[PDB]
């Protein structure tokens, strides 16, 4: 500071260490087809939210089953992205009119597709002066059989119902209908002119490939994977129908490798061929591969049905992360929400599959159905185990996001000590929770920043270099007992 | 291509107090205010970057990380907007091509030091050119530079690493004394900013 | 009214708006209930509090802030706090419910906590008096996304009532994370 | 790596040793005539599999 | 648990030099340790001992 | 058994060292390779396969 006139001065100084906070690690992302809903990614925390916002899947998709398996196994949060074969602007619309026939508002469905042709909007008048009520109804089945869509009890009870009571036409009020109808899973309203609508009912009229899974990337609209790559909470991605669309596995693995902060879960085909000839599709350290398919009860036929196991496995990942940590291998855990498997694998066949990076789901007598295998598809010996990759992702993202205060700071010993202290505190916390291995701190990790890592050419060019060394913990895959008679 | 100038980009948006609408203006005065604030709360040796802009609504364009890799090595300073952090100045270089005056705070520190020395030494003109005056001048300049060092402006774990001052028979010869010249030599080591923060992480030990 | 009326007059013998407030040394927190109807007022309030250096700013979200996965705080100051959502009250001219921002109730909670506990006590896990209900009910899954972003929530627990659940600032500096 | 714009960089380094794993050593191959079956080689882990 | 853990105050010849005295500066250095809230209350329960 | 042991060792080495192709030909790679092969052979020695 500068002191030019007499007085009292109070100044604040920076302290000797700054805390780092860990990031989320149990959020998932799903892609696939639905019947209703928007095409921008939305967060879901429960299965009833999913049924309310999106509905069911068509016969060519198995998204509903995968989300159900995710939440039955202890998952916490999903990001849903809806993929649609229709143009984004193929949306049903409508108009509201005033006393003498002026269009005052414009109603639009909340997503593209033919479903918007089955939405009815009903306007009625309220008992209080200058107020009216609005109702929105949606039927999932045939419209030809709906007898009284306007009455208090239609012939088939509607699938979705929404009512808004205290509405007004004053734009500066808090009960203006544009502000109240904004939280609605069915429609959108836009204001045009001054007036209040007349009573009655009205319907909305005039309504996949690899490039749809890739998504749209425009200045104000993102779908598909382009929409996911602008969300920083997702830590694992899955596409249940990845084997019906050629060229999607590589796109998913490339997305995860280019972001550098997420993991890919892959499932085998329904018919992968002979056992002696199976291989993994990719050779990435950012993916894992599971086998075989599973059996579930179908809620529209009440019969068994064969589905891929991806969502159940993502739910197992989330559960293990919540109750043990990211350093725990998500294997030797039970699958909930299924009836049986496609095949039963023996111990002789897994001796051929396990050294190849293929993870198996097996069933033991007296113990149930469990995941038996925790490897990645990688050939590098340094990234053979899955929990090591997940721990490194967690650590690296925490460091990246929690150190932006240090840019443009003086390149001298105070900043060096501060940075060293922060990183040491974070790594000691990780060590205390069982993630690092060693009976002392010197065995588990080290951090270096000073004149041993930086030279003078570095200081003259603006570079601050920190070197960190760590020792992760690995699972026990073979438990061996050697018993003898001696001593 | 001067060492006495800095160059900022792009324009900003403000509310106009006669129309109550947005309006696009150059960012010069906001940046000068940031300079003044940083000088008041940190010192002249602190780079006036990674600081927030107050009093605006938005920018003209949003610059990405790929475009700044082309602009930054050219001496052009950018104003960017980060999600979760706001609008900030990201760059602290001069328009100069000389490698000795690449950073802005070094030039500002030298301006400060040189003007202080120029204005606070006029008592020494026409004084006797002998050892007493030499010791007096040396002592004064050493006190000033040690004060600058203690406040974080100079770099080194000891005084010998940060600066030196010389005045005597090693700087002056006899032809100098006969012609009325008193020569003082000063050497200094300024501190520079941390522009790239690098973390190299491995699995060994 | 405009932004220049909220800024106030600054003449030798007349001060209104914020120019009038900056000559009073008792004020310790400032709030403007209608800050979302006048564009450019949030920044002016945060700048006033940062330039005086002795007061704190309380901010409320809009009535329609968008999807949950896209919310952010308006500023990145250590001199401000951000609360969400709106509340319901009885209107004394119609005797009906009405939706209002929660700023004044929260300032009253600040004052109460300061009187009965001290300035070192976090003004959270405290009850809101004088309301009827909230705008939305926030779950535990949605606050896991909002809390690490500096957004403070007002929630309702069964058996315990309506309470403020969160005590952070809008700041990104790790040294000024808590209020 | 190359550093052209200011920010934070995180980089991974290769470690000082890489593990080697032993290969299988107790699998056999048989050739001869049968009454049924395919003519591509198939893996068998039990005699009932062979008869089937 | 003690005063040395909570704060310190310094003013003397460790904070001021002679160039400071000659220019009219009096420097006081204060260090403090504030208390922070309990946001996560965690109970780890086991069967051992 | 000598022939069978050599078959085992040579195939393990062949299949578990493909990361080293096109790497820099300098002291770091040398130390890394030496360390890996020494660990494998010490494991073989501890199980009674080598003599000394």
Numbering used by the authors:
A (entry chain G): 2 to 208, 292 to 571
B (entry chain A): 367 to 571
C (entry chain M): 292 to 470
D (entry chain B): 2 to 53
E (entry chain M): 523 to 571
F (entry chain B): 471 to 522
Excerpt from the paper describing this PDB structure:
Here, we report on the structure and function of haloarchaeal contractile injection systems (CISs). CISs have adapted to a range of functions, but their conserved core is composed of a sheath-tube module (also called a contractile tail), which assembles onto a baseplate. To facilitate toxin secretion, the baseplate triggers contraction of a dynamic outer sheath forcing a rigid inner tube, tipped with a spike protein, to be driven through membranes. Our first major insight was that the CIS gene cluster in Hb has a T6SS mode of action, i.e., it functions while bound to the cytoplasmic membrane.
Next, we tested for the expression of cis genes by performing crude purifications of CISs from Hb cultures. Mass spectrometry analysis of these preparations detected the presence of Hb protein Cis2 (Hbor_38820), but no other CIS gene cluster components were identified. Using single-particle cryo-EM and helical reconstruction, we obtained a 2.9-Å resolution structure and confirmed that the sheath is composed of Cis2. Except for the flexible region between domains 2 and 3 (residues 209 to 291), all residues could be built into the final atomic model. Within the sheath monomer, three domains are observable, with only a section between domains 2 and 3 being unresolved due to flexibility (residues 209 to 291). In contrast, domains 1 and 2, which face the inside of the assembled sheath and facilitate the contractile mechanism, show a low root mean square deviation (RMSD) of around 1.0 to 1.7 Å. The Cis2 homolog from S. coelicolor showed the highest structural similarity for both the entire structure (4.1-Å RMSD) and only domains 1 and 2 (0.8 Å-RMSD). Contracted sheaths were observed as either free-floating or perpendicular to the cytoplasmic membrane. Our second major finding was that Hb disrupts proliferation and induces cell lysis of Hv in a contact-dependent and T6SS-dependent manner.
